[PDB]
Design a binder for this molecule. Sequence first.
Ligand SMILES: *[C@@H]1O[C@H](CO)[C@@H](O)[C@H](O)[C@H]1NC(C)=O
Lengths: 50, 29
Amino acid sequence: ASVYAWNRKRISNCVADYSVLYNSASFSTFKCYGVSPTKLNDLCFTNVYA
Amino acid sequence: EFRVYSSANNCTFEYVSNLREFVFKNIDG
Ligand SMILES: *[C@@H]1O[C@H](CO)[C@@H](O)[C@H](O)[C@H]1NC(C)=O
C-alpha cells in the first residue's frame, strides 16, 4: 500500500517465530524500541499489528 | 434461514470445529 493509505493487519492466536525473521540476513534496517530483539521469543503479548 | 447478522466490525478470536446438559462459566477472560 501507499504511504498515505498504509495497510494494517492484526495477528493473534498463534505461535510466532521472531528468530527466523532475525536471522533472515536479508533486511537492511532492524530497530526495536524498548524490547530486546534477541529476547523477543521469551515474551508473550496479546496481539500484534503489522 | 439465517437472518440475524448484518454487520462486520473489528473481529477477534474465531473457533471452528436422550437429553443434553451444558454449563457456561466466564472467568478471567
Ligand atoms: C475494535 O476493538 C479494538 C479493541 O480496543 C478497538 O481499539 C478498535 O477501535 C475497535 N474498532 C472499531 C472500528 O471500533
